[PDB]
């Protein structure tokens, strides 16, 4: 392996998603959940028990057609009902790309706010999983980041996932919530049983530091946390570790306030380098923090290839890759 809200229980990330979805269908009678194989509980168990609890009209399987799932969900949301669509793997979201980019994202704008699909959330498993190869490993957030009118949100843990998913479900804009699938059954943590929200477009500084800022999201936050620890131990370097959480609209202010303080930034993501979302963070931080930069902003990302099966250990931007880049940056 490469890596105050009332009563809580230990939940892994799949359980935390089921808890968010249960809390949503309890408190919002319009809400429905649908996609491929969601009725029996889903291929990653995220919807277990929900159809028996809430009814077959509210948690149901569709035909095997992603463009249909998203179009259908838009239509539910046009009537004001909450629509929680599932795409079985983020790698299979691309048949729906036209419905997401040309339709969901533009629905409110193009109608002058006469119609909208704000009550749509699309949730999908995301990121590498050890052996998923080209089509069960992708992290497509940079393709969506270039489309005004949608929000894209990626949690790093069970507590973060439930609070960010409830915020997406309740946000009045179409949201894509990418669930890092390698975390679904990883370590549990304490998660509140009742609903709570974590704001969108807000990064979290999870460790303060003064020499360098590290930014990542999803599972890669745990990698940079470990890198911070290696840097402290091996180099005496103090790292500020930031989970971006929302890809768009992203928290420019928190990232720039950190870099103005530290003077250095390394951003890391599993997705390929070219066109990846580190490119947007880097070019924005440069513009806002130019005079503070002690060294070039570093991007440690997946290579510009499809995601391989047998070579996955060599492809991913693991803690050694991030640490070696950080060492060069400190020494620039």
């Amino acid at each position: 392996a490469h890596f105050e809200y009332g009563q809580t229980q230990k939940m892994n990330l799949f359980q935390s998603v089921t808890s968010a979805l249960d809390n949503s269908l309890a408190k919002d009678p319009t809400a429905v959940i649908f996609g491929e194989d969601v009725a029996f509980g889903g291929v990653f168990r995220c919807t277990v028990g929900l159809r028996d609890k809430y009814g077959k009209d509210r948690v149901f399987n569709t035909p095997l057609c992603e463009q249909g799932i998203v179009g259908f969900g838009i239509g539910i949301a046009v009537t004001g009902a909450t629509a929680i669509a599932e795409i079985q793997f983020a790698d299979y979201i691309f048949p729906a790309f036209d419905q997401i980019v040309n339709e969901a994202a533009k629905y409110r704008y193009r109608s002058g706010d006469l119609f909208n699909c704000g009550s749509l959330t699309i949730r999908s498993p995301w990121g590498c999983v050890g052996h998923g190869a080209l089509y069960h490993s992708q992290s497509p957030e940079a393709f969506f980041a270039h489309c005004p009118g949608i929000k894209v949100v990626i949690p790093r843990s069970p507590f973060q996932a439930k609070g960010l998913l409830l915020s997406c479900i309740e946000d009045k804009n179409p949201c894509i919530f990418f669930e890092p699938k390698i975390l679904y059954r990883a370590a549990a943590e304490e998660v509140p049983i009742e609903p709570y929200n974590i704001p969108l477009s807000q990064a979290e500084v999870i460790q303060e530091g003064s020499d360098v800022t590290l930014v990542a999201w999803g599972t890669q936050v745990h990698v940079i946390r470990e890198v911070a620890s290696m840097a402290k131990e091996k180099l005496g370097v103090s790292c500020e570790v930031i989970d971006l959480r929302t890809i768009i609209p992203w928290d420019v202010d928190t990232i720039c306030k950190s870099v103005i303080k530290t003077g250095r930034l390394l951003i890391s993501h599993e997705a390929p380098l070219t066109g990846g979302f580190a490119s947007e963070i880097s070019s924005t931080v440069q513009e806002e923090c130019f005079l503070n930069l002690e060294a070039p902003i570093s991007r440690v990302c997946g290579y510009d290839t499809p995601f391989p099966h047998i070579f996955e250990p060599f492809y991913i931007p693991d803690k050694w890759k991030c640490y070696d880049a950080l060492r060069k940056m400190i020494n620039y």
């Binding site: 429905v32 057609c65 179009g71 838009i74 239509g75 009537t79 009902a81 409110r108 704008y109 006469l114």
Partner: protein, 374 residues
């Protein structure tokens, strides 16, 4: 005998391919002939005079507005237009069979549905001019209409995207115990998109109260139907999805009405989709339904040349009053290009708004600011 889950069928012990019936396809339902005569009295809906005159005045007013706005586009006064010629009967006949609150998803050439629903001429014009009265805020290409009050979902350019959306809205209506139908219009070219296969199948498997209304005018831009499909048009595809289907003469307002009325009644009672394929002639972007209905009126003795002349004058006056008003309204404030991207403008988008405002303070002489508001 066979026990396969995927189909209910018997065995056959001889190899026989199933052949399509294309040369003798699904027949075309007709109520009145080209002379306006009712062909089969048991099929006559015997609509009352005031409703039949509303059908005729809606189609002809749409035609009057089309002629004016088409000339406006040829002069460059609006950037684009596309007329409704040949589709007035389908637009208006089907809208008359709906309840006022049934939700409509359009395809392109739906202005007659809005006309029948008493959409103001001012508002058709405002959208084409992108002026301050457009509730769309001038953001879409002309002839992209929408109205929340009249349950007509804003049209978008991408073909067929509204088909699976209409199915979702119909599923939500079923859950709401709406007693409402959704209708979704699309052309025969748009039916080749993958989104049409998605919508047709989802509506059947999720049991949705939706009318799919395909206008088959024989062409998709330059593409004749021989290059668009090789089955018996679109109506023959419905039964393969489990959808009840019919084909109608789109130049016959009463055949369109009768089929839409019966599809609506059954879709709402049974929560099942219906497909209507209306055959027309593409007459016109930048044997007619009106003539047939006029012949009918002139039978019941319901219209005559004096009334026709007076209405032609009155409709032209109303269209021109609205056209004048539309041309003299300003365009909306350029700040409106930033709102409604999200419900709330993100701070980074507000920063871009502010940067345009600063830009126009310094460089505004270079921008066509004279007929933009504020």
């Amino acid at each position: 005998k066979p026990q396969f889950p995927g189909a209910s069928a018997e065995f056959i012990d001889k190899l026989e391919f199933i052949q399509p019936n294309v040369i003798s396809g699904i027949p075309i339902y007709r109520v009145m002939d080209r002379q306006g005569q009712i062909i089969n009295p048991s099929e006559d809906p015997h609509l009352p005079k005031e409703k039949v005159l509303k059908l005729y005045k809606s189609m002809t007013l749409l035609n009057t507005m089309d002629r004016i706005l088409y000339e406006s586009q040829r002069q460059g006064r609006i950037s684009f237009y596309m007329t409704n010629y040949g589709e007035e009967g389908t637009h208006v006949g089907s809208a008359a069979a709906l309840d006022n609150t049934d939700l409509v998803f359009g395809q392109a050439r739906e202005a007659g549905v809005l006309m029948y629903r008493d959409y103001p001429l001012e508002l058709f014009m405002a959208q084409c001019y992108g002026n301050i009265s457009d509730l769309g805020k001038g953001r879409q290409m002309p002839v992209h209409y929408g109205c929340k009050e009249r349950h007509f979902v804003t049209i978008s350019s991408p073909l067929a995207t509204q088909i699976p959306q209409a199915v979702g809205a119909a599923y939500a209506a079923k859950r709401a115990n709406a007693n409402r139908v959704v209708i979704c219009y699309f052309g025969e070219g748009a039916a080749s998109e993958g989104d049409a296969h998605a919508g047709f199948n989802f509506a059947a498997t999720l049991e949705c109260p939706i009318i799919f209304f395909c206008r088959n005018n024989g062409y998709a831009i330059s593409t004749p139907t021989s290059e668009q499909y090789r089955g018996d048009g679109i109506a023959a595809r419905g039964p393969g999805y489990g959808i009840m289907s019919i084909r109608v003469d789109g130049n016959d307002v009463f055949a369109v009405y009768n089929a839409t009325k019966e599809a609506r009644r059954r879709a709402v009672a049974e929560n099942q989709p219906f497909l209507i394929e209306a055959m027309t002639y593409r007459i016109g972007s930048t044997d007619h339904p009106i003539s047939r209905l006029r012949h009918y009126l002139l039978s019941q003795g319901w219209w005559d040349e004096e009334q026709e002349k007076a209405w032609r004058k009155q409709s032209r006056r109303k269209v021109m009053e609205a056209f004048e008003q539309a041309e003299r309204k300003p365009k909306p404030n350029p700040n409106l290009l930033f709102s409604d991207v999200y419900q709330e403008m993100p701070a980074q988008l507000r920063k871009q708004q502010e940067s345009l405002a600063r830009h126009l303070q310094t460089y505004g002489e270079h921008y066509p600011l004279d007929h933009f508001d504020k």
